[PDB]
Amino acid sequence: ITMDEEVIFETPRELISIKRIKDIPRSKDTHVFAACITSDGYPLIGARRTSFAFQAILSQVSTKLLRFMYYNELREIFRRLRKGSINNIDPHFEELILLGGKLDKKESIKDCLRRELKEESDERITVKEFGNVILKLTTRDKLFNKVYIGYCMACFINQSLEDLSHTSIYNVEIRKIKSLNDCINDDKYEYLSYIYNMLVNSKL
Ligand SMILES: COc1ccc(CCNc2nc(N3CCc4cc(OC)c(OC)cc4C3)c3cc(OC)c(OC)cc3n2)cc1OC
Ligand code: NA
Ligand code: NA
């Protein structure tokens, strides 16, 4: 990816634009993401603890939304839609997110990522080296028309994929950490692949 050129991806749920930028704006708190590459060369992705569809429903059922929730969330909704409800369609859905979190503008991007990666990983991830390229990710969700922005950098970590296979049940942020290639059927797979490919190629 070249400085300030933008690439656009569409999924059934989102329109996302990905653009290389020089500096993250520091007028407000922002969100920063890590494209994390394990020591054995696998790209990592997190499964968000709560799905975006369920969070949207809570903050406000369309059946397109029932295709994009976790099964425990669905059971909570169906217990209310059907009286003696004992099961419902399970879409085998996971809400894929890059690891990372909030950057106020006290801290460097690097200290922020080290901290958030260690909290989201139950203190297992440590960063061997960072990349130098920052990508701005702008998503517009199609169902609720909300716009969300975050900034992504490469993190080459010390741990192997296998090191990160289990995640504590008390992890408030993510249900698990996995390889992105274990998510090929997810509708975010194309643009997440692009992010990793661009950040790794820039590193090389
Ligand atoms: C209508 O009412 C609401 C609705 C939602 C919400 C949740 C807002 N929080 C939030 N939203 C995000 N988006 C954008 C993407 C997206 C995608 C969807 O499908 C794929 C989607 O399907 C429905 C909704 C969203 C909202 C985020 C995106 C991220 O990209 C990586 C991220 O990184 C960690 C964190 C994000 N956090 C609050 C509402 O009430 C105020
Ligand atoms: Na589930
Ligand atoms: Na995809």
Long-range contact pairs involving 10-16 (C-beta distance under 8 Å, separation at least 24): 11/187, 11/188, 11/190, 11/191, 12/142, 12/187, 13/68, 13/141, 13/142, 13/143, 13/187, 14/139, 14/140, 14/141, 14/142, 14/188, 15/139, 15/140, 15/142, 16/137, 16/138, 16/139, 16/140, 16/191
Quoted resolution (Å): 1.8
**Which ligand is nearest to the Cα of residue 137, counting in written order?**
1
Residue nearest atom 14 of ligand 1, based on CA coordinates: 148
H-helix or E-strand containing 18? Answer: strand 14-21
Q: Is 139 in the pocket of ligand 1 (CB under 6 A)?
A: yes
The single residue listed with the structure tokens 């922005």 is: 149
Q: Is 144 in the pocket of ligand 1 (CB under 6 A)?
A: yes
**Elucidation method:** X-ray
